[PDB]
């Protein structure tokens, strides 16, 4: 069950995309 | 406790919608 | 230590704001 | 396992930056 949990944490980790998307949006907005 | 944990994680996972909404905004603002 | 963990999960929960902000941005963008 | 867990959670928490970046975008796009 600890494993299920850690599996859910890796699914949550699969956030950096969101960060990347945001950086890209700011730039498309003219910074 | 551990079922509160698994449930809080399912509540958090239930984020990809956010990523996809951002993918849309980025697409909308992209070069015409 | 289970408590520490559940505390971190409530901190993560404190995401709906992000959703709200996004809905507001789409609307400000002219939908 | 449990330290991998606590560490993955600290890696996730390390989100508020995202909220605040969105608060900025919303502020920028707000009525002049």
How many CB atoms lie under 10 A from the CB of residue C18? 19
> Under a CB-based contact definition with an 8 Å cutoff, are residues B6 and A3 in contact?
no
**Which residues of D are less than 8 Å from A3 in CB distance?**
1
Q: What domain range includes position D17?
A: 1-32
- Counting the structural domains of chain A, the total is 1
Listed resolution, Å: 2.2
What SS3 state is found at B32?
A: coil
Is C28 in CB contact (< 8 Å) with chain B? no
Is C30 in CB contact (< 8 Å) with chain D? no
Facing residue for C25 by CB, picked from D12, D18, D25: D25
CA B7/CA A7 separation, integer angstroms: 13
Contacts 24+ apart (CB under 8 A), D28-32: D28/A29, D29/A29, D29/C25, D29/C28, D29/C29, D30/C28
**Which residues of B are less than 8 Å from A24 in CB distance?**
26
Q: How many CB pairs under 8 A join A and B?
A: 40
CA B15/CA C30 separation, integer angstroms: 23
CB contact under 8 A, C9 and B14: no
Q: Which two tokens stand for residue C16?
A: 């709906």
Ordered alpha helix ranges (H), B1-32: 2-13, 16-28
């Amino acid at each position: 069950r600890m494993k299920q949990i850690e599996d859910k944490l890796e699914e949550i980790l699969s956030x950096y995309h969101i960060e990347n998307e945001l950086a890209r949006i700011k730039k498309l907005l003219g910074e």
